Amino acid sequence: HMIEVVVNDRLGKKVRVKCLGEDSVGDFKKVLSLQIGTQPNKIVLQKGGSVLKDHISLEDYEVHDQTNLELYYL
């Protein structure tokens, strides 16, 4: 049931993160952070300008395979 989410940063870097729709946004941030060398509390994710809350699943935000998210650093 693997999906690959595309995370887009403010320098135009695209980072692809393999995960599950059932993963929480918080757990997605944990994996992303280790992939890119940061920590979850140092970053924010948005989907279409709306901030993703840690306790809600990717799938509940309609985050699917190839969905784009926007990454911001605190």
Binding site: M2, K18, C19, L20, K30, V31, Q35
Partner: peptide, 18 residues
């Protein structure tokens, strides 16, 4: 990142594998 290295990260975080 490969599925395998992703799963290494997931396992260390105490998450279910893909």
């Amino acid at each position: 990142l490969s599925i395998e290295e992703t799963n290494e990260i997931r396992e260390k975080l105490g998450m279910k594998p893909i």
